[PDB]
Amino acid sequence: GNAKIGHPAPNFKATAVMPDGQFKDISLSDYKGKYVVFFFYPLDFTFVSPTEIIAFSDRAEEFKKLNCQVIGASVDSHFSHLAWVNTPKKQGGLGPMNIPLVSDPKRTIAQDYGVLKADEGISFRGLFIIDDKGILRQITVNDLPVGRSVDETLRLVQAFQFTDKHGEVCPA
Amino acid sequence: SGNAKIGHPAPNFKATAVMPDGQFKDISLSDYKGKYVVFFFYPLDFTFVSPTEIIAFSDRAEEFKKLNCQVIGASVDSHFSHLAWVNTPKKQGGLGPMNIPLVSDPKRTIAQDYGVLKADEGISFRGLFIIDDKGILRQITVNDLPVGRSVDETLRLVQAFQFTDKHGEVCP
Ligand SMILES: COC(=O)[C@H](CO)NC(=O)N[C@]1(C)CC[C@]2(C)CC[C@]3(C)C4=CC=C5C(=CC(=O)C(O)=C5C)[C@]4(C)CC[C@@]3(C)[C@@H]2C1
Ligand SMILES: COC(=O)[C@H](CO)NC(=O)N[C@]1(C)CC[C@]2(C)CC[C@]3(C)C4=CC=C5C(=CC(=O)C(O)=C5C)[C@]4(C)CC[C@@]3(C)[C@@H]2C1
Numbered sequence: 001g002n003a004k005i006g007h008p009a010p011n012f013k014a015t016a017v018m019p020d021g022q023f024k025d026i027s028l029s030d031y032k033g034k035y036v037v038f039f040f041y042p043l044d045f046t047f048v049s050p051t052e053i054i055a056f057s058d059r060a061e062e063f064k065k066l067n068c069q070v071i072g073a074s075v076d077s078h079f080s081h082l083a084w085v086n087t088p089k090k091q092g093g094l095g096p097m098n099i100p101l102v103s104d105p106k107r108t109i110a111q112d113y114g115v116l117k118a119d120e121g122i123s124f125r126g127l128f129i130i131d132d133k134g135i136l137r138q139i140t141v142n143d144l145p146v147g148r149s150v151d152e153t154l155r156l157v158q159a160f161q162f163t164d165k166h167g168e169v170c171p172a
Numbered sequence: 173s174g175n176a177k178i179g180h181p182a183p184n185f186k187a188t189a190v191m192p193d194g195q196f197k198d199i200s201l202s203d204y205k206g207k208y209v210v211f212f213f214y215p216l217d218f219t220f221v222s223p224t225e226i227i228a229f230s231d232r233a234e235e236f237k238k239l240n241c242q243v244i245g246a247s248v249d250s251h252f253s254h255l256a257w258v259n260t261p262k263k264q265g266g267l268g269p270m271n272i273p274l275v276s277d278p279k280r281t282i283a284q285d286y287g288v289l290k291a292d293e294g295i296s297f298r299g300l301f302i303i304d305d306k307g308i309l310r311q312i313t314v315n316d317l318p319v320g321r322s323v324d325e326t327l328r329l330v331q332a333f334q335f336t337d338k339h340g341e342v343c344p
Contacts, residue, residue, distance in 0.1 A: 005297055005316050006290070117179070124178050138319070141312040142329070143178050145336040152325045156315070163318035 001114025009136040010112040016100040017081045035068040036130040040123035044076045044084045048147050055150045060098035073102035174287020182309040183285035188251040189273040208241040209303040213296040217249040217257045221320050228323045233271035246275035
């Protein structure tokens with residue numbers, strides 16, 4: 001792919017299901033000025049991904065406190081995303097979301113980020129930390145069965161922000 | 173770039189390492205078939221963030237041994253540089269005695285194979301790779317230089333891959 005540490009993260013423009021339940025076309029560049037956590041999950045209506053998606057959504061305020069936007073993505077259609085959002089949580093659904101969920105039906109965003117599982121047209125569990133200038137700072141890719149940690153993601157975002165500011169602090 | 177792809181054999185290498193007993197030995201990734209491997213790069217010796225990471229993995233090597241997991245560190249520095257850093261006591265800014273081997277990659281080919289060579293600076297990013305007992309790459313982690321890695325998170329991942337290896341694999 002085109003995701004390289006220290007280089008601009010690949011832009012994308014894609015339809016997402018937004019927290020209000022409506023569809024909107026969004027771009028990574030919409031979020032310049034904020035840190036971004038951009039994470040891929042394989043498919044809707046699965047059993048490892050909902051733990052991650054719900055954790056990032058439940059804890060969205062902790063990312064907001066770090067001026068950090070979280071965005072999820074999968075190759076499944078935006079209609080499929082909303083169907084899972086609208087599935088009651090007690091039946092295995094996501095429930096209302098605090099983060100947008102991008103649809104990548106052409107697989108070009110996963111390819112751009114180097115996380116397409118080519119023999120099975122879905123993304124690996126890629127997670128990318130992009131700074132406020134659009135520069136890629138961190139790459140995480142898990143094989144399909146193993147999920148990610150919101151605690152670890154917050155540790156990384158905060159640490160990148162602290163090290164960003166080091167030489168810019170008052171010299172008193 | 174690089175040849176490190178999830179679900180494919182992790183790129184083999186054969187290189188000089190400083191072993192835990194303080195002596196040089198030429199080792200290969202394939203030496204560790206039958207065990208999980210955590211293989212991690214750091215930018216160069218005698219630095220300031222890297223020793224904290226190296227010493228943390230070394231100090232906690234027994235937690236990986238309990239998981240039948242070998243930890244291996246690497247950088248582009250010469251094998252003599254590694255030994256001098258080990259031979260410098262921790263209280264004077266060195267590593268002190270190590271429980272993990274440290275691989276030397278002076279031709280930069282291992283860093284290139286794993287896709288973590290930083291262009292025109294001749295050093296690796298903070299790459300970390302989880303390789304299963306069959307030699308297959310399961311996890312990719314790459315941090316930009318200012319932010320270190322977590323032993324807790326690495327153990328979480330190794331444990332999670334070993335957990336999911338227990339159910340549903342092609343050979344009963
Ligand atoms: C007329 O234009 C202006 O006033 C502009 C601002 O717009 N100031 C400006 O250019 N200062 C200059 C000339 C240029 C910038 C530097 C060299 C670098 C930072 C600086 C050492 C420094 C950093 C940290 C605080 C400081 C004092 C505090 O009371 C405090 O709370 C904080 C947190 C001081 C100690 C005040 C002086 C300081 C700002 C100087 C002085
Ligand atoms: C499949 O080959 C056979 O069963 C032949 C008869 O044809 N038996 C055979 O060699 N038995 C022996 C001698 C004895 C039985 C054991 C020790 C145990 C299972 C085994 C590790 C094992 C399990 C799972 C697959 C395997 C290879 C594949 O290509 C595959 O798709 C699948 C799903 C392999 C890796 C092939 C070797 C394997 C069968 C050996 C070898």
